[PDB]
């Protein structure tokens, strides 16, 4: 049963990674539906559609490499359902980055998670991994949408559109 | 409550529009299950790993371009949980060829009562739409596909690994 | 006698080093004979040779690395007699692949403890160190080894000459 | 009172953060010192003094890099004063190349505390920051410091002017 | 005692040149602080960090050629500390500015200064220095920081946070 | 048991082949511990490291030719332990140049007793394989170890450490 290239992988890293793996497409699916909100006639901020569409795309890479770790370590990949995200209607370009910022905390608290395991586990290469390629991406993603956030409450939004058009011209675009 | 760009868009259409966009997701989530399932390291076939993830990432181009189609047709997005795919264990190049046609067909006879239902509500929009991007699309892949089945199965597979071997490095390659 | 560079570095992690350094320039010429043995006139897997090759190029350089390593933090390099291969005669493009995946788990393994020891003595530049040149290269190699064992069993190796003959040309080749 | 951003940062890795932005920022004026001792037209080392200069502008990258962490972990920069160097008058290139290996070793030194506080604080983000940035970078500068100071001493500095003048020549340029 | 190269150079001119050394550093480690202000999280202004990083560069690059007037007139460097700036949290955009414009108006003064005692002390080459290199930069420099203040003032900084983006944008960006 | 190319070769040539073999192999393990003797912190003779590291390099290569005539005559090759060398610390840039020269000269005296036994078992083809590629290499190689040798000595190495300097950077680099 064991793979013939699995060493010093425990069965709870295994687990876990399947569930980060998941987490990463619900992310992916999130951001997918922030973007087609900003493509709507009634919001139309293509800059917004586009930055959220950029980010589904990243979470979709960031699930592939999960999977493609598990399949290196000798695990193997077990998918579940993605959930829909939590609204069809994010109301608001400022909403949605918040909504994002909260949504990549989460990922990052998971990311810690999965850390403190491998290390508990005794795997520096899968805390190695997690370091490399995701810790720091999502500290940079957290800090990214903070700052679009920040300066959005600054403008005025959300109840300035104004502010909203001008910081999807200005920023994102 | 009706969009300002809405025009000829029935309900059912917006609604039949809304169930092709998570069958479309769905089967991108199958062709990566597939894919991550050729690279495990007791499969071991990369060409076919890269046909799959090649064959999940247009099914996403596609619900992309069918939610862009509902939000130009001033139609309303809502998304649904996509479903996990009926196997983790494809068992076989050819038992995963011959589930990828099974796939395509059933997206196909989607796509044709989709088609149906425009022509019953005289939307020679969604129509053309759906002819020009879609109908020969799944006509071109159910050829595709029949045409790896019947190659792998008259090479020997499931049972000839070299069979698969072979068409991996041949066909795929 | 201490060195003036050497700054958190006990002698036990220099002891581990120097015989990594040993079992690196072992795999190296493990991965030599092992070429040189597909390159003999009743063999004849050209490929088989080159890719052995190139493997005992690459653990040389591994070894190198420790060495390095080793001067940079204040260590001192202490060589050992390189022990000569398990075998003379490799048998097999199959039987070679499993002893190469042997071996790599084996380095594999060392390193880990080697990882292991670094952290108890509070050596984080050790730790990266090996994470960041030694344990993933391991992970892929392990990786590849598999995928290549996988193959050349399904092919019919090693029975089938055809087997290995077809898999030198279209892996290695 | 608490940045949107900040998530598994402790107060005490704060701190320590601005401790040693402090200690780059007094470790650039050191080199900054020594490079227009060596300017001086009673020593007239012009290597030396590019040397020492570009070690001083590469403390102020690290100290910049630092403050740019601690923006995007949601900590808050505290600066404090720049002590002056311990010397105006670094007396020799060997004797300038001791004092940066010494001052070198200190910041190698604090940088292992904060990794060392950072791991208890299970802060994998700052702790591979740290591992990937800084302690290499030490190691590295550290072995090349004592390199010089090797060479010097063999070539007879600091009483043989001319073994300074050659070094300044051939080493340093 | 007296350096070789040293002609018409007088101690108080030398006091003066070691004192405005150290003001230009501080002024250096001031426009550091605000750039890395605007850095933070929750204020945003990616555009004002740059601007004050280019300026923190430029003041220190003042500093050094000071430092190499000092050796090149034979005078003795004597570093002091350097203080921290007066504030941590520079509030907004238009404060900024206002206190790099004090800060600007500050510096010439001391530069003016230093040209009296050049000129006081019949020193033709110091004062031309001054003139060449400093003060018209500080013109200039001012005048600069003038505008900014004005167009921020006119635009509603800094109350408008708006305003503090568009300036962001479009005159620094 | 014979192999089918074997012609004209004596398994006493082969048995010397293979003698050769392990010597060469020696010979590059000898080189690499003196490599890497000159990076040590204490030693720091950059250009003497590299010399003996590309003298390693070459010896390997004499090592694999000598497996490839080995197979090429139908000849099986027999691998022996890699004895570690004789000194883990050569004292100087003198004292491992004359301990190059005594092996490079031990090296030649092996390659010509074995020309010796090639010509006694007429074996012209084998003959000329080592005059080609072995007898002249060995030639240039002792007389260019010889001039570094005399060099060093009328420089004043080993107690002129500057002498050894001075060599390492106009000789070697
Ligand atoms: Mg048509
Ligand atoms: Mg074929
Ligand atoms: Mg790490
Ligand atoms: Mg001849
Ligand atoms: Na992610
Ligand atoms: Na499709
Ligand atoms: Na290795
Ligand atoms: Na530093
Ligand atoms: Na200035
Ligand atoms: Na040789």
């Known amino acids: 049963s064991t793979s013939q290239v699995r060493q010093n992988y425990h069965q709870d890293s295994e687990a876990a990674i399947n569930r980060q793996i998941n987490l990463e497409l619900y992310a992916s699916y999130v951001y997918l539906s922030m973007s087609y909100y900003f493509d709507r006639d009634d919001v139309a901020l293509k800059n917004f559609a586009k930055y959220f569409l950029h980010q589904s795309h990243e979470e979709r890479e960031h699930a592939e490499k999960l999977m493609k770790l598990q399949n290196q370590r000798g695990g193997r990949i077990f998918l579940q359902d993605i959930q829909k ?89």
């Open 85 to 173: 995200p939590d609204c069809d209607d994010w109301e608001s370009g400022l909403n949605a980055m918040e909504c994002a910022l909260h949504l990549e905390k989460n990922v990052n608290q998971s990311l810690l998670e999965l850390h403190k395991l491998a290390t508990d586990k005794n795997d520096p290469h899968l805390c190695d991994f997690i370091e490399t390629h995701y810790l720091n991406e999502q500290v940079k993603a957290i800090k990214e949408l903070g700052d679009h956030v920040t300066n959005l409450r600054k403008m005025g939004a959300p109840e300035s559109g104004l502010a909203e058009y001008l910081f999807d011209k200005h920023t994102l675009g």
